[PDB]
Design a protein around this ligand. Sequence first.
Ligand SMILES: *[C@@H]1O[C@H](CO)[C@@H](O)[C@H](O)[C@H]1NC(C)=O
Lengths: 49, 49, 133, 49, 145, 49, 33, 262, 49
Amino acid sequence: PVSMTKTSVDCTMYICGDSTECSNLLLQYGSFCTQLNRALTGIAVEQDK
Amino acid sequence: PVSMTKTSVDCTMYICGDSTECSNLLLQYGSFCTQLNRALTGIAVEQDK
Amino acid sequence: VKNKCVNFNFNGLTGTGVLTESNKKFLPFQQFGRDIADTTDAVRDPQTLEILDITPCSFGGVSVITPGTNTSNQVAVLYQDVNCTEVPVWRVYSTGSNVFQTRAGCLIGAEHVNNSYECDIPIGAGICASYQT
Amino acid sequence: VKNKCVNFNFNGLTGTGVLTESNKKFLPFQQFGRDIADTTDAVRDPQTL
Amino acid sequence: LIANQFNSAIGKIQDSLSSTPSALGKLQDVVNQNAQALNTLVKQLSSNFGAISSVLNDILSRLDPPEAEVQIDRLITGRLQSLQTYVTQQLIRAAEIRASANLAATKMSECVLGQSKRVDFCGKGYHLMSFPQSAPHGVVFLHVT
Amino acid sequence: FGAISSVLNDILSRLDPPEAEVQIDRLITGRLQSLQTYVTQQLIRAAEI
Amino acid sequence: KVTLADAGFIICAQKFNGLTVLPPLLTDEMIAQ
Amino acid sequence: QCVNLTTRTQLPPAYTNSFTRGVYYPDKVFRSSVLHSTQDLFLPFFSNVTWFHAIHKRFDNPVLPFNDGVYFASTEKSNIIRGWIFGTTLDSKTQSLLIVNNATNVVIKVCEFQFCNDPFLGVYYHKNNKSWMESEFRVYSSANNCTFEYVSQPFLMDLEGKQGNFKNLREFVFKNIDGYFKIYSKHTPINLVRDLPQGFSALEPLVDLPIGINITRFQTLLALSSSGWTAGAAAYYVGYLQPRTFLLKYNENGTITDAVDC
Amino acid sequence: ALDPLSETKCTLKSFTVEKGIYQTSNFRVQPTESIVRFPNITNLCPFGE
Ligand SMILES: *[C@@H]1O[C@H](CO)[C@@H](O)[C@H](O)[C@H]1NC(C)=O
């Protein structure tokens, strides 16, 4: 094997799917969604490398 | 590369400083901080190894 | 008060640490001061116009060094990350027969020698401890 | 109306999206249609069946 | 002639490292990553996590012990979860660094201490020898080919 | 997850915000921890590949 | 050429909440030896 | 007493590009050489703002809405704008805020007034003594129920002055949150004809008031028998605030040096 | 709470300890006194009138 398919999951549209109050209540949880997106983008760059 | 920087985290002073009642709330959670210090200790040994 | 770890309340801002006269140049409306960590480290005294640096007072972990209990019952202690001029804050190994200063911190209970051998128990910064005559 | 991103409200069941004509051959006792993720994707209009 | 070519190549190596500033990036980012990991750890301290305040004292100085356990429980859960994430990341990264270090030790044992016949193991071309140089958190091989 | 439903819009269609937050906290907890599990498993598999 | 990213975030450097960095067992000099 | 002034030149309203203006310190925490992001009510960069001016033929003082703070700038010579009115209806069905920059005092109060159609203050033009004496104070018709007043130290200020270029660039922003009025400001020496400049300037926090009332509309006040008048040139610009998210950079001494819209 | 050797026996849960280094008993200098600071407030209410 060489690589896998590069995937990406948007945090907010996954969890609080098109809700405004849900995004606001998500906002108190720090910075998880940035960390998740950073990890996934690092994986996707690594596959092409 | 060869090694990263070793680092260590004191669990209780991280979680809550100075509040002994927070410690009373923490001590019902079992022995998590033992696991945390054990994992970081293993990493810090493997760096020098 | 100054130069001791105290817990404080400056105008609703509570904390603990040692206070120092600072050199930071505030703007006149500025009261607090923060870090890149957004952690308070600079407080303007309400009574008199001055800048106070806040340092959290020191701490650390205890390292304990021993041979096997099949061998001996004497141990040594490393207070990490501390220039051990304020060591004693068990108590019996707080003033015992020497203190030794390393880049790791303060070593108490071992006597510093001049010769160099191979490493036995890795303490740090090229410094190792062993049990010998 | 059809073929627009709109807000819709069918029998209290609300959402946002685009409505189009289906070919799903329902049986008369059925009203809704569901997905793997338990999301509505096929709705019988109460006024016109 | 070989002496002249060798000395010229060494001088060009010095010039190439002193010119291009984007060379040591493989070392640098790892350090940067650890730094920002620690950085974002601090940034999880000041979240509400659904509790009333992120200041522990202000919850203690305003809400009563019949009810304050509910808020501080939320604070416990959030901070514990952040520790979980941080050390899981550290474990994976450390395993990766260990793999790269084993590769480095193999390269030091074969390319430097002897002459390997594996093609393109010790750089491009037919391998002659290697010299190691120390580096902050790493090693730099100079392959002579 | 122990709440009334797994549908986000139905809870906002029926509840006041001071109880919508009560349900949505549990929902956001469950979904977030599931996503955490997924990203950790993906990291391990990427290292293997 | 090698520089740290953030100043003070890699001798009195003790972090405010429980973060410590352990010095390596081998220093700079004997590795060069 | 208060009369209606009619004789003017009629013009359509003008807009001007607020390039990068209207930044203020969000708090009182000192930083040093720090890129920090906040999210707050701000004037967006590169919007168009309402431009009003008193020239020669112009007395342009309407009532403007106040929602979520406003940013008010003025290019002026000899301090013709003097006051600010605030209130929901300005007519004693609701409480009313009065800010006056008198030649003697600055008067800050809230009572229950009924203001006129064209409230203003009127100063004469060189009445054989080389002084412009302020003579007319035509603001409200009564002061019914009062709740809070303040007057500062008396002083003197020049009520006369003519320049080919305005020197005063006074910048203000006003906010109301949870019963609190926030006045944030800056003064700048300037040399420009009929425009607002390009550049960076922070606003220091100046005044907080714990008032506790609902505010919807406002109007400023101008310096100048019932018809027949002489006013110097002045101009002002009005922009509105929107909840935005910014990045700010702090220098080593801790002044906000530049800003980034997200 | 007696001696460092006994502290190692207490946290490793054994009556035998082999040779090496261990990490126990994180400490703090434990500050001495309290202090509060406030502005030099002088604007009294005239109760004499
Ligand atoms: C702002 O107003 C000016 C007035 O001339 C107009 O030209 C411009 O298009 C306007 N811009 C926006 C974004 O409305």
